[model samples]
Target: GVCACPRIYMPVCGSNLKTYNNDCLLRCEINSDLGRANNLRKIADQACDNLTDNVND
Candidate 1:
């Protein structure tokens, strides 16, 4: 599988409580195609404040 995407780091937060480079990269990270899936949102203008899974707060 070839994942071709721009290497740009913006700053986004997924509902799964994870930091991403940008909304594009976030989409690649999200693998939930089920009926139940958390929506990704921009939490900060920069990368996650922490490296913890519960950094959504």
Candidate 2:
């Protein structure tokens, strides 16, 4: 028998940052596990661009 699991996205633009599981465990485990410290920064910058309409609508 296979176990079922629900997948969760860390966070994405157009979604409130507050909706994410920002606890240290999720942050350290999922977000930073790959050492991609710049990912969130890039996302934030892109989000800014999105807000300014600099990116695609």
Candidate 3:
């Protein structure tokens, strides 16, 4: 038997993310090196802000 509840994962950024209708969007920066973690973090922050701002407009 399969459960209808959605599975949650550790935060990729800040915290407390919610999925609607058991669905959510994922955004990632594919940096294949350890040093690029900071860059990826910045990208994630900008992407989230941009998305929120666009939705507000």
Candidate 4:
């Protein structure tokens, strides 16, 4: 089966310091990194704000 996510703009920030469009997308990314040691997680309910260092920065 194919995985899909809604188009809603519910943003979420991960512990990896990445911003996801939605929780669904973030979970998808988590599943992709299941075996890795980065231990990514949802830290905030909104996009990564200026308070924290940007992932690209």
Number of the predicted model whose TM-score against the real structure is largest: 4
Candidate 4 colliding pairs: none
- The candidate scoring highest on lDDT is 4
List the global CA lDDT of all models.
Answer: 0.58, 0.34, 0.30, 0.77
Model 3 alpha-carbon drift over 4 Å, by segment: 1-8, 14-31, 34-38, 42-51, 54-56
Better of 2 and 4 by TM-score: 4
Question: Candidate 4, overall lDDT?
Answer: 0.77
Model 3 over residues 1-57: C-alpha lDDT tens digits? 222433544233321222222222223222324324444322233223323433457
Counted clashes in each candidate structure: 0, 0, 0, 0
TM-score of 4: 0.71
Instruction: For candidate 1, list the clashing residue pairs, or say none.
Output: none
lDDT tens digits, residues 1-57, model 1?
334559886777665556777777766655445212555444554566554554443
> How displaced is residue 11 in candidate 3, in Å?
2.5
Q: By lDDT, is 2 or 3 better?
A: 2
Backbone clash pairs for candidate 2 read none
- Comparing 1 with 3 on lDDT, the higher-scoring candidate is 1
lDDT value, residue 30 of candidate 2: 34
Candidate 4 error regions (>4 Å)? 53-57
- Models ranked on TM-score: 4, 1, 2, 3
Clashes of 1: 0
Tens-digit lDDT string for candidate 2 (1-57): 222323643433322322232233234433453424444322232223235433444
